[PDB]
Amino acid sequence: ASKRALVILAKGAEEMETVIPVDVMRRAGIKVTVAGLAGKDPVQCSRDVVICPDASLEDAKKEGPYDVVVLPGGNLGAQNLSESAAVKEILKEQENRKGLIAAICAGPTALLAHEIGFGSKVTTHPLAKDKMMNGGHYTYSENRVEKDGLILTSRGPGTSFEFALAIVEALNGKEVAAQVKAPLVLK
Amino acid sequence: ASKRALVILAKGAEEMETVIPVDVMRRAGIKVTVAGLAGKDPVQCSRDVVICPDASLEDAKKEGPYDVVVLPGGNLGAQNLSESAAVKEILKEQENRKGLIAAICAGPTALLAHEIGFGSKVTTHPLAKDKMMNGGHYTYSENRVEKDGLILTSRGPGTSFEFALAIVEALNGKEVAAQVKAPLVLK
Ligand SMILES: [Cl-]
Ligand SMILES: [Cl-]
Ligand SMILES: [Cl-]
Ligand SMILES: [Cl-]
């Protein structure tokens, strides 16, 4: 069976950090559900790109479990994720079942909000470090992608490909990640 | 007055090559219109991301002229662009007024189809080289971004940030491009 990914899409998400992982994961043969936090209506992202989700989160969360739960960044998107009881339940269940959780840019701050993965080495966007580190519940890294067991984090739009390929490597292995990578013309 | 960009969005466009330039150009303060080739309805991109355009191309083309016309890639998107009389008219008018034309991945093959910028040095995705070079009307480059006067081309999803920043540099200058670049956490 193919691996499955849930990408939780909130108003104010960073559209690059949403689309790059969705696209790359689909290139890797992962079945990706783009789930709208607020419902099935189109989502206005941080830079005004409007993305139509595959499903509401309400519906998608009934079709679990997923091999990865992905949290895009965008400050306002991440705040929305941080405020959601549905997201809290999903991430706690994912942590409890030892499933991967992946978050980029400000996205990792939603892990703090929901008390997920404390003790992990993490990265974030430089501008999100102080938020993430409030209370000292994580150990900070400046690596472009950081993975500490089942918590996978990354820094910003420019690390999105590396983040997505790390997800692919974790789920489908190094060879699939290398095969997906080559046609992308990465630096 | 701010500079203005028209991004022409066709079914089968590469969503990363669509969203990265839109987002980066908006970060640079460019007024970007995402124009749907087929009309104002949501567009299903190559990897099934669905993007809602700002306007139809029919409508957006009445609000010209634009400082840049941007053609995303995606093989099926580029074919759609190549088959469109509306796109032909837009690109011919843009070339005639010495305005920038920017195309990525397979996107440059639409320049061939519409007989735009012959004699220019161009790049494309490696898999689109032979299509682009049919007839020897361009000189090929393996540079990640190529700019020959008002024809700006680039290779693939992984060169999208460099492509977008080259657009920004051309329109708003080197300092604005460097300022936009820094928060992206590029390699
Ligand atoms: Cl943001
Ligand atoms: Cl290739
Ligand atoms: Cl394609
Ligand atoms: Cl910064």
Side-chain angles (χ1 to χ4, degrees):
Chain A
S2 300
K3 301 292 162 91
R4 298 174 71 227
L6 178 66
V7 176
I8 308 180
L9 177 54
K11 185 174 197 304
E14 224 299 328
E15 43 269 76
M16 296 184 287
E17 295 170 8
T18 301
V19 172
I20 288 160
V22 168
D23 180 324
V24 170
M25 287 189 293
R26 286 181 172 151
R27 287 172 179 256
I30 297 165
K31 303 175 58 168
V32 179
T33 301
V34 179
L37 181 61
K40 204 176 140 62
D41 291 335
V43 179
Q44 184 185 9
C45 295
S46 70
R47 275 67 183 177
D48 281 347
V49 173
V50 176
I51 297 173
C52 299
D54 299 320
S56 67
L57 186 63
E58 186 179 335
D59 285 343
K61 78 180 189 199
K62 293 171 185 135
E63 306 297 327
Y66 297 87
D67 301 288
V68 61
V69 177
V70 180
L71 309 183
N75 289 326
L76 280 59
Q79 185 64 38
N80 287 322
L81 296 172
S82 295
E83 290 173 358
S84 167
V87 172
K88 189 182 304 292
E89 186 176 32
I90 289 168
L91 294 173
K92 285 195 184 298
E93 288 184 11
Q94 185 75 339
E95 184 183 40
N96 282 345
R97 70 184 286 284
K98 304 177 183 169
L100 188 66
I101 298 169
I104 184 162
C105 203
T109 69
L111 306 178
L112 173 61
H114 295 310
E115 299 186 343
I116 306 292
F118 285 3
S120 301
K121 192 159 176 173
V122 298
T123 196
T124 70
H125 195 276
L127 291 168
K129 174 181 181 178
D130 291 352
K131 183 170 194 73
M132 187 68 173
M133 289 299 290
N134 184 334
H137 296 292
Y138 305 97
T139 298
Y140 202 73
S141 172
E142 294 182 3
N143 290 328
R144 291 175 62 78
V145 179
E146 191 57 66
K147 185 182 185 293
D148 194 7
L150 295 162
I151 300 291
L152 196 163
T153 56
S154 189
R155 309 207 75 186
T159 66
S160 293
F161 289 98
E162 293 153 78
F163 171 69
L165 290 165
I167 299 166
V168 170
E169 177 174 337
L171 269 42
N172 287 349
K174 290 188 178 238
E175 179 66 7
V176 168
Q179 295 163 350
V180 170
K181 178 177 179 181
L184 297 176
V185 201
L186 291 172
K187 199 146 178 269
Chain B
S2 300
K3 301 292 162 91
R4 298 174 71 227
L6 178 66
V7 176
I8 308 180
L9 177 54
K11 185 174 197 304
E14 224 299 328
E15 43 269 76
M16 296 184 287
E17 295 170 8
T18 301
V19 172
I20 288 160
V22 168
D23 180 324
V24 170
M25 287 189 293
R26 286 181 172 151
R27 287 172 179 256
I30 297 165
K31 303 175 58 168
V32 179
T33 301
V34 179
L37 181 61
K40 204 176 140 62
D41 291 335
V43 179
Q44 184 185 9
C45 295
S46 70
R47 275 67 183 177
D48 281 347
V49 173
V50 176
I51 297 173
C52 299
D54 299 320
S56 67
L57 186 63
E58 186 179 335
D59 285 343
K61 78 180 189 199
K62 293 171 185 135
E63 306 297 327
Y66 297 87
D67 301 288
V68 61
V69 177
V70 180
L71 309 183
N75 289 326
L76 280 59
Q79 185 64 38
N80 287 322
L81 296 172
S82 295
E83 290 173 358
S84 167
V87 172
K88 189 182 304 292
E89 186 176 32
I90 289 168
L91 294 173
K92 285 195 184 298
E93 288 184 11
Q94 185 75 339
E95 184 183 40
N96 282 345
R97 70 184 286 284
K98 304 177 183 169
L100 188 66
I101 298 169
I104 184 162
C105 203
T109 69
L111 306 178
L112 173 61
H114 295 310
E115 299 186 343
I116 306 292
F118 285 3
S120 301
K121 192 159 176 173
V122 298
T123 196
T124 70
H125 195 276
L127 291 168
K129 174 181 181 178
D130 291 352
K131 183 170 194 73
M132 187 68 173
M133 289 299 290
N134 184 334
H137 296 292
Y138 305 97
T139 298
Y140 202 73
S141 172
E142 294 182 3
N143 290 328
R144 291 175 62 78
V145 179
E146 191 57 66
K147 185 182 185 293
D148 194 7
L150 295 162
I151 300 291
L152 196 163
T153 56
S154 189
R155 309 207 75 186
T159 66
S160 293
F161 289 98
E162 293 153 78
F163 171 69
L165 290 165
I167 299 166
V168 170
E169 177 174 337
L171 269 42
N172 287 349
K174 290 188 178 238
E175 179 66 7
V176 168
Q179 295 163 350
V180 170
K181 178 177 179 181
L184 297 176
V185 201
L186 291 172
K187 199 146 178 269

